[PDB]
């Protein structure tokens, strides 16, 4: 048993009726001094280390050549000037096991935390020494954390893509289905999670060019995609993860849900394909009034109207679909479908719930397209256009497939540094750079949408950690007040930075002129409502920091009207799974699942107290399962009103709660404006 593992295990040994939280500092110190400093390759000078890394196919010479070696040396000096110390053993362990650069035989360590941060900053700045130093200060202070793909792969020769979330539209054709399988395998090969919209595919028992009842439906494509993701398993390193989305009004919705039942047949069940259900307000209205609902065959609707069923507004077109004799449909019970959804989420956590009209009522790019589905993590909500992949000899009609770059602000570190504006703007610049430097050669729609939309996702994390370390309960109204003010400021400065980038480059995103940013409809609630804190305690948290006012929002609206907006989408709160340990932060804006995290690595078990956990703030670190899910919905809806994309919203459920309770939580989330629901986690 390692000495650091023993020291970390002494936290649970209760001394004087309290956990020995101070043992984790001893644990991380022992871990470093006994393992990391021994296994860290050291070089006489930074020049020798850099030369070894570039010449041994570890780094990319292209981005490092943009600086003189003096500038790189000063950047590394800035990284090491902070003397950053990992507060807990788990932070250092996670970094040096997941993100630190290792030898080709994975025996020694080439990169420290400062080295990784310096390389990421030098890649972000793209030749600017002052910008690189600013990125170094931002990341070594741990105010901003680039996503796992960006943080892990930036500046590496043998790297995967810096983007890991992709959203593909699948057209109702064999050519398009085969192309979707190919693109899914190509993107999973790069290590990215792929989400596929299956709503355009015609249901089971539909006609294929005069041969009636010939289509296997969305479940055959589901099996094809599941096997495609199983094959494209990231070179046998990490299991290929993909998601499939279907509209709740699709005829195959019941077959779509049956793929996740525990009793599902092996010719129906899918293993590596997550499922998400898109629910328009029409379905919730039908279930509310207990009226019997209809699911429609998409190809009949396409033949009758020339438009896909998911391309049309179900709220206005549902009655026309039902009254149309040429549109084929089957009666369903919407309340029974909701109960089936809740039962499936209780059993397996699936499907994801995307409230279509909650997303699109505040969507800023409805002119481009409505948001029809989400990503594998249920936070990316962007307009997509389906591609028409024709025969081999013909020319394909390339659409827009969603792919955004992820980054997370550390709310605790941003708040303690009083640097919401600077951190938000620098994170926006880094995400923009990642967007520009991303080129995917086998997904033409993804590449076209990356070039045109220039969408980024700037998330946040350590919300519960910051609140509990400041004596604020997560469910308290003061917590929602802080979230309101903080994310209003984040949105303000992200919009300001996007407009500044548009002014600097003289270009906006494609079809910006039709957006609500161009017409000013986006800024209505910001120029009409004041989002300053309503509590003296919360207003004291923002001391020394200018909170944007109504006049500031009017000035921003005028600036955006004059100069445009560079990013179609800016903010999305991803789960931030493994980077939260490195940042000593609670995952995303979700509340903590456990106060002290018990995990086993190898044959040794490890203990991870939540960051900042102590005796004084023990009960402010309330576990998510002990919380009222209605208040968590209230918090996420408070945050969601300032996030243009969605938020990964995990439901934390007790074992005693019923199917009716899960349905009530989902319906209250729909009522409160929640866009997506990620997971149903039961204790």
């Amino acid at each position: 048993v390692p000495k650091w593992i023993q020291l970390n295990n002494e936290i649970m040994i209760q001394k004087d009726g309290k956990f020995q939280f101070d043992k984790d500092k001893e644990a991380v110190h022992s871990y470093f001094v006994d393992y990391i400093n021994q296994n860290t390759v050291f070089f006489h000078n930074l020049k020798e280390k850099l030369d070894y890394l570039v010449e041994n196919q570890y780094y990319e010479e292209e981005f490092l050549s943009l600086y003189s070696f003096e500038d790189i040396k000063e950047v590394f000096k800035t990284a090491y000037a902070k003397k950053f110390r990992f507060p807990s053993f788990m932070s250092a362990f996670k970094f040096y096991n997941d993100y630190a650069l290792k030898t080709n035989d994975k025996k020694k360590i080439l990169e420290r935390y400062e080295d990784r941060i310096s390389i990421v900053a030098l890649f972000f700045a793209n030749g600017d020494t002052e910008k690189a130093k600013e990125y170094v200060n931002l990341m070594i202070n741990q105010e901003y954390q680039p996503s796992t793909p960006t943080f892990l792969n930036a500046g590496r020769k043998r790297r995967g893509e810096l983007v890991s979330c992709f959203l593909l539209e699948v057209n109702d054709s064999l050519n398009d289905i085969s192309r979707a399988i190919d693109i899914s395998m190509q993107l999973s090969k790069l290590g990215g999670g792929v989400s596929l919209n299956l709503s355009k595919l015609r249901a089971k028992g539909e006609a294929i060019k005069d041969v009636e009842n010939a289509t296997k439906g969305v479940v055959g494509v589901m099996k094809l995609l599941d096997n495609a993701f199983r094959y494209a398993d990231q070179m046998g390193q990490r299991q290929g993860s993909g998601a499939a989305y279907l509209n709740i009004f699709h005829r195959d919705i019941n077959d779509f849900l049956d793929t996740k039942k525990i009793s599902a047949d092996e010719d129906v069940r899918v293993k590596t394909l997550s499922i998400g259900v898109v629910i328009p307000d029409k379905f919730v209205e039908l279930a509310r009034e207990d009226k019997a609902a209809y699911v429609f065959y998409p190809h009949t609707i396409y033949k009758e109207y020339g438009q896909h069923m998911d391309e049309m507004d179900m709220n206005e077109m549902y009655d026309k679909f039902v009254d149309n004799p040429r549109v084929k449909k089957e009666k369903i019970n919407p309340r029974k479908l909701l109960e089936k959804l809740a039962m499936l989420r209780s059993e397996s956590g699936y499907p994801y719930i995307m409230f279509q009209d909650n997303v699109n009522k505040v969507h800023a790019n409805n002119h481009i397209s409505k948001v029809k589905f989400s990503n594998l993590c249920s936070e990316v909500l962007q307009a997509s256009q389906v591609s028409s992949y024709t025969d081999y000899d013909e020319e394909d009609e390339i659409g827009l497939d969603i792919s955004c770059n992820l980054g997370s602000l550390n709310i605790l570190n941003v708040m303690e540094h009083k640097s919401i504006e600077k951190t938000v703007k620098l994170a926006t610049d880094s995400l923009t750079h990642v967007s520009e430097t991303t080129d995917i050669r086998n997904a033409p729609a993804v590449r076209r949408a990356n070039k045109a939309m220039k969408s980024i996702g700037l998330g946040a994390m350590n919300l519960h950690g910051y609140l509990a370390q400041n004596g604020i309960a997560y469910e308290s109204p003061e917590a929602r007040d802080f979230a309101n003010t903080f994310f209003m400021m984040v949105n303000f400065y992200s919009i300001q930075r996007s407009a500044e980038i548009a002014k600097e480059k003289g270009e906006t995103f494609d079809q910006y002129e039709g957006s609500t940013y161009a017409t000013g409809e986006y800024f209505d609630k910001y120029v009409s409502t004041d989002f300053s804190p309503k509590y003296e305690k919360i207003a004291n948290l923002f001391e020394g920091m200018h909170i944007p006012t109504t006049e500031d929002w009017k000035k921003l609206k005028a600036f955006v009207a004059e100069h445009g907006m560079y990013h179609s989408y800016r903010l999305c709160i991803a789960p931030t799974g493994s980077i939260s340990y490195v940042q000593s932060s609670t995952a995303s804006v979700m509340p903590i699942m456990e106060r002290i995290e018990e995990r086993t690595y190898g044959n040794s078990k490890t203990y991870y107290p939540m960051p900042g956990l102590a005796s004084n703030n023990w009960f402010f670190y309330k576990e998510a399962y002990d919380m009222d899910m209605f208040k968590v919905v209230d918090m996420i809806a408070t945050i969601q009103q300032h996030i243009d994309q969605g938020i990964s919203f995990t439901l934390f459920l007790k074992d005693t709660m019923t199917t009716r309770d899960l349905n009530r939580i989902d319906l209250y989330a729909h009522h409160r404006g929640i866009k997506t629901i990620y997971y149903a986690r039961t204790k």
Partner: peptide
């Protein structure tokens, strides 16, 4: 399988 319970209305109103 926690416990299936039907939606008995007034769960759609808040």
């Amino acid at each position: 399988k926690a416990t299936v319970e039907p939606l008995k209305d007034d769960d759609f109103y808040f």
